């Protein structure tokens with residue numbers, strides 16, 4: 001099943017260097033189901049961030065791992081289905097920093113699809129997880145794929161703001177040093193990290209200033 005049949009053409013051209021690594025992950029995920037070990041998100045959502053145009057990404061948000069709880073992970077980092085309540089704790093924290101920063105009402109639901117439609121790539125360093133076992137798919141070979149994806153967005157001769165949430169900041173800043181790119185970091189919005197530097201980081205209106213700075217359009221961050 002060639003990438004072109006799983007992701008947007010731009011992305012498929014961007015990810016040809018790791019097309020094998022991608023196929024190998026499909027074998028891994030197949031072996032996981034065979035062994036009675038489901039994964040999240042759903043197979044159709046695993047590469048979903050790369051379903052929005054490679055050539056339209058203005059802001060890259062990089063997390064760690066998909067939500068480990070069944071019903072949560074939808075293949076856009078931090079996003080959940082429109083009817084999901086309560087929200088996952090990372091998303092609740094994000095939304096509070098959202099209203100602090102931008103002064104907009106608390107969003108209705110946790111569906112971050114509007115951001116994806118407006119050039120925000122919602123990326124996780126690792127794109128699958130064993131349910132109720134956080135970070136369980138670290139080291140399984142996603143890292144090569146997300147690094148090629150990040151490296152490819154940086155070499156793209158267009159403005160990019162990277163928002164590096166959590167332990168992958170110092171690993172990802174180097175891939176993102178380029179005249180057209182700025183990487184801003186904070187501790188992860190997860191409950192244990194969020195109090196020591198996520199709250200008050202005002203990343204959304206920082207991102208916008210850096211864009212307007214680079215002559216590019218600001219993101220409209222407004223969620224219904």
Ligand SMILES: O=C1CC(=O)NC(=O)N1
Nearest residue numbers: 063064065067077078090
């Ligand atoms: O809880 C979560 C969900 C996600 O998509 N990305 C993260 O790093 N943390």
